[PDB]
Design a protein around this ligand. Structure first.
Ligand SMILES: NC(=O)C1=CN([C@@H]2O[C@H](COP(=O)(O)OP(=O)(O)OC[C@H]3O[C@@H](n4cnc5c(N)ncnc54)[C@H](O)[C@@H]3O)[C@@H](O)[C@H]2O)C=CC1
Ligand SMILES: NC(=O)C1=CN([C@@H]2O[C@H](COP(=O)(O)OP(=O)(O)OC[C@H]3O[C@@H](n4cnc5c(N)ncnc54)[C@H](O)[C@@H]3O)[C@@H](O)[C@H]2O)C=CC1
Lengths: 415, 415
């Protein structure tokens, strides 16, 4: 009620909103629908440009398909191999006044671009750890594809509800055995903070292994196998990171590392199951450190990546998710001579572990301070890549314009 | 529900919003709380700078006090004469997701700045045409001031509900007798549109006089008088515009002009009432054309003002609301020698009616086209002034930042 009330249409501004980056730590509480779409198209375009990949799979299940490496797999499979993709993820739909998660908009754009190139895209939104979601996934494969010939396992979560026990496990990102003096990056104030991270309880290590270890991967392959929806000679891989000695106290030999080691264990039993089924295979694929929602949350990583970006950009070996996963498909998943390591893992992370990069990064680490951040490190590149995750800082996108956050997805099974 | 749901605070972004100009025609559906505040402070600052005005009123009622000329009076009275001001207006409070009107935020900032300088500020929000609002206004004067010594009548509305009949009159902005070929400015496409405005029915002229004529002004003075809340020797003025021959077909000799003429009629009876009461007075004050919500809605005005701004800026006589009203107080309402005209109206609009300005404007009018708008006219200045009304384009204001639209007002009587 004012003096000109009702003599004037409210218009669409009432249902739409201006969406801008809102960052606290490694958390961004907003996502831009138009920019996620454009970010995804950027990745699709990269794969299209590099060109088709021969000897690729044709019916692919990606578990964790909405963001980061899982999305990059979905795009590589789809636009590089022409594969049909069934994506499983866990994301918040957008609604009025309330932007959905990144993953939601990424997947909406994925379905859109897939349809444009005549590719199959269906997705399932819900807890991948649950039996219910597994069943829904099997039914979808049954009805539409008959079988899948590749299963990409790409989950990153801070928790898991055991499909059998009631128990809710929580992921812990601590060091093991001994406390660590962390010299990190405060991303908001843009200074060097200095922490001390206490090592994890056994109880926490067990929880981290339960979340990010290989049990669920195993449960998935088994469920798929005995529903008969896995093709003979099928291939499944789960992503992991090794890093080098600088990251080791926190990651590889930390609690998250304990989980990733459980991975190398479970992959044996799973490989056995796929070997028996028409000469199939199961590998752990090691990828380089990139900026994603998962890696951001890892202590030391923001500064590590800031440095890593600087060195590798100079060296010319800098890549993100989509380049990593494309080359993982081309060189190792589909290629003649695969990059196998001593443990029998595929490898795409070697350019990062180049001893020249690691030494150059290491000597820059102890010597970074509040005055030289923008000269010793590519903190700028990092920030930009972080914002990119959420659809921000994209070129061609008008962030001052109204956008409707209520973006729906065709052929989206909601569980 | 996503994978990291609840492990993360939503934060204030949930209740706040980014507010940007949203303009369709002479309508802007948003207003910026921080910018309205800053716009008001700009005006206050101007008055403070020019310096105190001697011989001013001390207890002032401003009817139509939230925007445009009425606000400018409220600020001049308050910050130039140190007067206590009781403001009457009709505005929409802000709430979450829904910016209030300009006037609302203007008044919130007014109460704020007034309190800072120890001045009295109370306002009443509701229909000034109604008896109820008049009563509420009288009670407020009774309780806090005893009496007012100045009544500024500054209403601009497209309608009026007669306080006695049920009848709802609607204001019409048409020419009289004969149709008009209007050469105007399309403000969105930024081209020259060309219309044909049919003259108004008698029925519409009567409605326009009922809305913007002097009946309500009269009803106000009377109501005040016989409640005994008007001081002896009180002064009341109502604002009007005359313009020159270019504006005459649409304004002065149009339907709105019929109303403004009813003003000159009613002011006689009202002056008689104030003369009898201790030597008081009632005048019609004529002000120059400025950019406001009221004038924007008037055909031909956008282009007229665009031109007028250009010429007067060059001449150095360009002013807006606050300069007009300050000088109206200084020179004519409070000053020794008042600018009285043949009809006995006060005048602040003379710099506009300078025959040199009007001729220069006129020869530019027929000769403006889609290619020369940004060189023949100050369409830029116009747009900026228009945006300023709603708190936009203000310097020092971060329009990318979240702002809470729920801004409340102390000592605000809501009717
Ligand atoms: N980010 C890096 O630097 C590297 C990442 N990785 C690994 O790649 C994998 C993926 O990590 P990112 O792509 O970085 O993380 P991410 O946060 O971008 O993606 C996680 C994906 O899993 C989904 N997800 C999480 N919980 C789920 C649930 N309960 N049910 C269904 N979907 C769920 C998300 O929706 C999303 O699609 C992980 O194994 C991670 O350790 C390995 C090498 C380095
Ligand atoms: N804008 C111009 O170029 C000129 C304006 N004027 C006159 O000055 C007066 C004010 O006009 P502006 O300041 O331009 O318009 P405006 O739209 O800025 O202000 C109108 C004011 O009256 C209030 N109002 C409208 N209806 C109301 C109602 N039913 N109850 C209570 N309050 C109500 C609004 O809240 C606002 O405070 C009018 O008489 C107008 O004709 C005269 C000379 C030129």
């Amino acid at each position: 009620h004012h003096h000109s009330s009702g003599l004037v249409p409210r218009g669409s501004h009432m249902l739409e909103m201006i969406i801008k980056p809102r960052v606290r730590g490694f958390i961004c509480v907003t996502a831009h629908p138009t920019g996620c779409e454009a970010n995804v198209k950027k990745q699709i375009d990269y794969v299209t440009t590099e060109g088709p990949i021969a000897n690729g799979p044709k019916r692919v299940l990606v578990i964790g398909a909405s963001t980061g490496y899982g999305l990059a797999a979905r795009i590589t499979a789809a636009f590089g191999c022409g594969a049909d993709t069934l994506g499983v993820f866990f994301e918040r739909p957008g609604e009025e006044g309330k932007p959905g998660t990144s993953g939601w908009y990424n997947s909406a754009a994925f379905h859109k671009f897939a349809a444009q190139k005549g590719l199959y895209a269906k997705s399932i939104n819900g807890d991948a750890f649950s039996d219910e979601i597994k069943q829904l996934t099997i039914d979808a494969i049954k009805q539409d594809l008959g079988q899948v010939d590749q299963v990409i396992y790409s989950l990153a979560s801070p928790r898991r509800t055991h499909p059998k026990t009631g128990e809710v496990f929580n992921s812990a990102l601590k060091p093991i055995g001994n406390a660590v003096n962390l010299r990190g990056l405060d991303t908001d104030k843009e200074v060097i903070k200095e922490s001390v991270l206490q090592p994890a309880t056994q109880s926490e290590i067990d929880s981290t292994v339960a979340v990010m270890g290989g049990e669920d991967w195993q449960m998935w392959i088994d469920a798929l196998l005995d529903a008969g929806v896995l093709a003979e000679g099928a291939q499944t891989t789960a992503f992991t990171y090794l890093g080098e000695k600088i990251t080791h106290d926190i990651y590889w030999n930390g609690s998250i590392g304990a989980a990733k080691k459980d991975l190398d264990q479970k992959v044996l039993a799973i490989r056995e199951s796929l070997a028996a089924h028409g000469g199939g295979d199961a590998r752990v694929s090691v990828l380089k450190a990139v900026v994603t929602q998962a890696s951001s949350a890892i202590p030391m990583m923001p500064l590590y990546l800031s440095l890593l970006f600087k060195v590798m950009k100079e060296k010319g070996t800098h890549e993100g998710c989509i380049e990593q996963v494309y080359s993982l498909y081309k060189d190792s998943l589909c290629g003649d001579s695969p990059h196998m390591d001593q443990e029998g893992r595929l490898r795409a992370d070697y350019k990062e572990l180049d001893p020249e990069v690691q030494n150059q990064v290491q000597q820059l680490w102890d010597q970074v301070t509040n005055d030289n951040i923008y000269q010793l490190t590519d903190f700028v590149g990092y920030k930009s890549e972080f914002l990119n995750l959420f659809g921000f800082g994209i070129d061609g996108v008008d962030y001052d314009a109204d956008v409707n956050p209520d973006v729906k997805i065709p052929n989206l099974i909601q569980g």
